[PDB]
PDB file of C-alpha atoms in Angstrom:
ATOM      1  CA  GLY A   6     -64.195 242.934  12.326  1.00 47.87           C
ATOM      2  CA  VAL A   7     -62.642 239.497  12.829  1.00 47.53           C
ATOM      3  CA  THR A   8     -59.948 238.496  15.344  1.00 46.29           C
ATOM      4  CA  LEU A   9     -57.765 235.350  15.496  1.00 44.24           C
ATOM      5  CA  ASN A  10     -57.847 233.319  18.730  1.00 50.38           C
ATOM      6  CA  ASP A  11     -54.392 232.534  20.256  1.00 54.35           C
ATOM      7  CA  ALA A  12     -55.456 228.863  20.545  1.00 54.89           C
ATOM      8  CA  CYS A  13     -55.458 228.534  16.718  1.00 56.26           C
ATOM      9  CA  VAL A  14     -51.678 228.932  16.256  1.00 55.76           C
ATOM     10  CA  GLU A  15     -50.974 227.107  19.563  1.00 55.18           C
ATOM     11  CA  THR A  16     -52.929 223.978  18.596  1.00 53.77           C
ATOM     12  CA  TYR A  17     -51.427 224.092  15.097  1.00 54.11           C
ATOM     13  CA  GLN A  18     -47.942 224.271  16.628  1.00 55.04           C
ATOM     14  CA  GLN A  19     -48.924 221.233  18.737  1.00 56.75           C
ATOM     15  CA  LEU A  20     -50.038 219.396  15.569  1.00 58.67           C
ATOM     16  CA  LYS A  21     -46.782 220.442  13.880  1.00 60.47           C
ATOM     17  CA  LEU A  22     -44.456 219.397  16.787  1.00 63.22           C
ATOM     18  CA  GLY A  23     -44.737 215.733  17.737  1.00 59.87           C
ATOM     19  CA  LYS A  24     -47.467 213.172  17.594  1.00 61.34           C
ATOM     20  CA  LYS A  25     -50.576 214.099  19.577  1.00 58.50           C
ATOM     21  CA  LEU A  26     -52.704 215.427  16.667  1.00 61.88           C
ATOM     22  CA  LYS A  27     -53.506 214.410  13.100  1.00 64.06           C
ATOM     23  CA  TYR A  28     -55.958 217.250  12.235  1.00 65.96           C
ATOM     24  CA  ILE A  29     -57.625 220.465  13.440  1.00 66.73           C
ATOM     25  CA  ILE A  30     -61.031 221.947  12.474  1.00 66.49           C
ATOM     26  CA  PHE A  31     -61.340 225.770  12.635  1.00 67.71           C
ATOM     27  CA  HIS A  32     -64.565 227.813  12.414  1.00 69.82           C
ATOM     28  CA  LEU A  33     -66.154 231.286  12.970  1.00 70.46           C
ATOM     29  CA  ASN A  34     -67.822 231.655  16.393  1.00 72.70           C
ATOM     30  CA  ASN A  37     -69.112 236.700  13.250  1.00 74.09           C
ATOM     31  CA  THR A  38     -66.319 238.011  15.563  1.00 76.36           C
ATOM     32  CA  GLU A  39     -63.504 235.411  16.072  1.00 74.50           C
ATOM     33  CA  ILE A  40     -61.842 232.452  14.343  1.00 72.47           C
ATOM     34  CA  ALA A  41     -61.550 229.550  16.811  1.00 71.36           C
ATOM     35  CA  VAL A  42     -60.701 225.852  17.072  1.00 72.29           C
ATOM     36  CA  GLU A  43     -63.894 223.817  16.713  1.00 72.66           C
ATOM     37  CA  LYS A  44     -61.916 220.657  17.378  1.00 73.02           C
ATOM     38  CA  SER A  45     -58.739 218.600  17.309  1.00 74.55           C
ATOM     39  CA  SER A  46     -58.294 214.899  16.656  1.00 75.80           C
ATOM     40  CA  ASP A  47     -55.662 212.238  17.214  1.00 77.73           C
ATOM     41  CA  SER A  48     -57.394 209.928  14.719  1.00 76.96           C
ATOM     42  CA  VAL A  49     -55.301 208.415  11.930  1.00 76.62           C
ATOM     43  CA  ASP A  50     -58.531 207.506  10.038  1.00 78.73           C
ATOM     44  CA  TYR A  51     -59.132 209.912   7.153  1.00 78.57           C
ATOM     45  CA  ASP A  52     -62.888 209.060   7.266  1.00 79.42           C
ATOM     46  CA  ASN A  53     -63.142 210.617  10.758  1.00 81.82           C
ATOM     47  CA  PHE A  54     -61.809 213.842   9.199  1.00 84.54           C
ATOM     48  CA  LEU A  55     -64.417 213.686   6.424  1.00 86.68           C
ATOM     49  CA  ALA A  56     -67.134 213.133   9.068  1.00 88.48           C
ATOM     50  CA  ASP A  57     -66.174 216.386  10.867  1.00 85.65           C
ATOM     51  CA  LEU A  58     -66.594 218.424   7.665  1.00 87.87           C
ATOM     52  CA  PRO A  59     -70.267 219.348   7.978  1.00 89.97           C
ATOM     53  CA  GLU A  60     -72.119 218.779   4.716  1.00 92.15           C
ATOM     54  CA  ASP A  61     -73.981 222.141   4.789  1.00 93.47           C
ATOM     55  CA  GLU A  62     -71.486 224.454   6.585  1.00 94.45           C
ATOM     56  CA  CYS A  63     -68.099 226.009   5.841  1.00 93.95           C
ATOM     57  CA  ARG A  64     -64.965 225.198   7.826  1.00 92.96           C
ATOM     58  CA  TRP A  65     -61.225 225.522   7.596  1.00 91.94           C
ATOM     59  CA  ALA A  66     -58.975 222.645   8.584  1.00 96.04           C
ATOM     60  CA  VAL A  67     -55.384 221.551   8.785  1.00 95.69           C
ATOM     61  CA  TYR A  68     -54.534 217.897   8.106  1.00 95.17           C
ATOM     62  CA  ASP A  69     -51.155 216.232   8.610  1.00 95.26           C
ATOM     63  CA  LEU A  70     -51.260 214.270   5.377  1.00 96.27           C
ATOM     64  CA  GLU A  71     -49.050 211.183   5.119  1.00 93.74           C
ATOM     65  CA  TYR A  72     -48.171 209.541   1.759  1.00 92.88           C
ATOM     66  CA  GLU A  73     -45.834 207.229  -0.139  1.00 89.62           C
ATOM     67  CA  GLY A  79     -40.355 205.529   2.568  1.00 92.03           C
ATOM     68  CA  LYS A  80     -43.128 208.067   3.324  1.00 93.50           C
ATOM     69  CA  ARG A  81     -43.572 211.866   3.256  1.00 94.68           C
ATOM     70  CA  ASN A  82     -45.803 214.267   5.270  1.00 91.50           C
ATOM     71  CA  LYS A  83     -47.452 217.486   4.157  1.00 91.91           C
ATOM     72  CA  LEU A  84     -49.378 219.965   6.284  1.00 90.73           C
ATOM     73  CA  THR A  85     -52.535 220.577   4.258  1.00 90.84           C
ATOM     74  CA  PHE A  86     -54.852 223.601   4.599  1.00 89.79           C
ATOM     75  CA  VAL A  87     -58.433 222.939   3.524  1.00 87.40           C
ATOM     76  CA  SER A  88     -61.047 225.584   2.781  1.00 88.49           C
ATOM     77  CA  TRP A  89     -64.352 223.715   3.066  1.00 89.26           C
ATOM     78  CA  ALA A  90     -67.101 225.580   1.207  1.00 88.28           C
ATOM     79  CA  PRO A  91     -69.853 223.130   0.244  1.00 87.55           C
ATOM     80  CA  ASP A  92     -72.520 224.206  -2.264  1.00 88.65           C
ATOM     81  CA  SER A  93     -75.423 223.700   0.189  1.00 82.51           C
ATOM     82  CA  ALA A  94     -73.894 226.076   2.789  1.00 82.52           C
ATOM     83  CA  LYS A  95     -75.537 229.497   3.052  1.00 85.16           C
ATOM     84  CA  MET A  96     -73.953 232.252   0.931  1.00 85.64           C
ATOM     85  CA  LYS A  97     -73.741 234.657   3.916  1.00 87.72           C
ATOM     86  CA  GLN A  98     -71.543 232.037   5.612  1.00 91.24           C
ATOM     87  CA  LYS A  99     -69.444 231.428   2.481  1.00 89.10           C
ATOM     88  CA  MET A 100     -68.812 235.179   2.151  1.00 91.93           C
ATOM     89  CA  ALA A 101     -67.721 235.450   5.814  1.00 92.41           C
ATOM     90  CA  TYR A 102     -65.296 232.508   5.584  1.00 91.81           C
ATOM     91  CA  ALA A 103     -63.966 233.785   2.235  1.00 90.09           C
ATOM     92  CA  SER A 104     -63.219 237.238   3.731  1.00 89.59           C
ATOM     93  CA  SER A 105     -61.653 235.834   6.952  1.00 88.16           C
ATOM     94  CA  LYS A 106     -59.670 232.907   5.383  1.00 90.76           C
ATOM     95  CA  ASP A 107     -56.359 234.738   4.839  1.00 90.91           C
ATOM     96  CA  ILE A 108     -56.250 235.921   8.467  1.00 89.20           C
ATOM     97  CA  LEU A 109     -56.072 232.281   9.624  1.00 90.68           C
ATOM     98  CA  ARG A 110     -54.024 231.074   6.619  1.00 90.55           C
ATOM     99  CA  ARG A 111     -51.279 233.723   7.073  1.00 88.51           C
ATOM    100  CA  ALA A 112     -50.898 232.785  10.777  1.00 87.98           C
ATOM    101  CA  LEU A 113     -50.149 229.091  10.037  1.00 87.64           C
ATOM    102  CA  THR A 114     -46.450 228.686   9.126  1.00 86.66           C
ATOM    103  CA  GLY A 115     -45.180 225.841   6.930  1.00 84.74           C
ATOM    104  CA  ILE A 116     -48.377 224.775   5.145  1.00 84.83           C
ATOM    105  CA  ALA A 117     -47.247 222.622   2.186  1.00 87.95           C
ATOM    106  CA  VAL A 118     -50.544 222.209   0.266  1.00 85.36           C
ATOM    107  CA  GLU A 119     -53.885 224.013  -0.014  1.00 85.57           C
ATOM    108  CA  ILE A 120     -57.240 222.545  -0.961  1.00 89.45           C
ATOM    109  CA  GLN A 121     -60.431 224.428  -1.817  1.00 91.83           C
ATOM    110  CA  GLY A 122     -63.298 221.942  -1.449  1.00 91.61           C
ATOM    111  CA  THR A 123     -66.869 222.500  -2.692  1.00 88.84           C
ATOM    112  CA  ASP A 124     -68.049 218.864  -2.599  1.00 88.56           C
ATOM    113  CA  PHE A 125     -66.971 215.684  -0.787  1.00 86.35           C
ATOM    114  CA  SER A 126     -65.141 214.294  -3.873  1.00 86.84           C
ATOM    115  CA  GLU A 127     -62.800 217.318  -3.766  1.00 88.43           C
ATOM    116  CA  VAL A 128     -61.642 216.406  -0.209  1.00 88.77           C
ATOM    117  CA  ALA A 129     -61.628 212.592  -0.729  1.00 89.76           C
ATOM    118  CA  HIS A 130     -58.342 211.049   0.374  1.00 89.92           C
ATOM    119  CA  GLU A 131     -57.154 210.003  -3.103  1.00 87.26           C
ATOM    120  CA  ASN A 132     -57.916 213.454  -4.573  1.00 85.29           C
ATOM    121  CA  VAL A 133     -55.999 215.129  -1.708  1.00 84.44           C
ATOM    122  CA  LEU A 134     -53.033 212.714  -2.088  1.00 80.86           C
ATOM    123  CA  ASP A 135     -53.088 213.405  -5.863  1.00 83.60           C
ATOM    124  CA  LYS A 136     -52.846 217.195  -5.306  1.00 82.62           C
ATOM    125  CA  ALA A 137     -50.183 216.650  -2.614  1.00 85.26           C
ATOM    126  CA  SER A 138     -47.758 215.476  -5.357  1.00 86.84           C
TER     127      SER A 138
END
């Protein structure tokens, strides 16, 4: 049913290799997983703004914390107010995308904004 776009791994590799990207938002177009967007923004609140409050997404975030450490963080965004048909589709396609991304250090399943808040994500990242 569902096919992975080549641009997903490519953009992730770009995030992973050198400093042009801080996060990536993935989404279903349904038939293909695709990059909804990329960002160079260091501001964690810009990331939170791109998680739509009533829709599911996946994301990767290059999480920095305290020298300092970095961890590539996969986020399944599945907010309560999103439609169940959408939640079921993302749930059944997740692993396709997740398996293709090499070197993910932490995973987050988020059902409300407090579960993806920076402090909560930093907490889980140690």
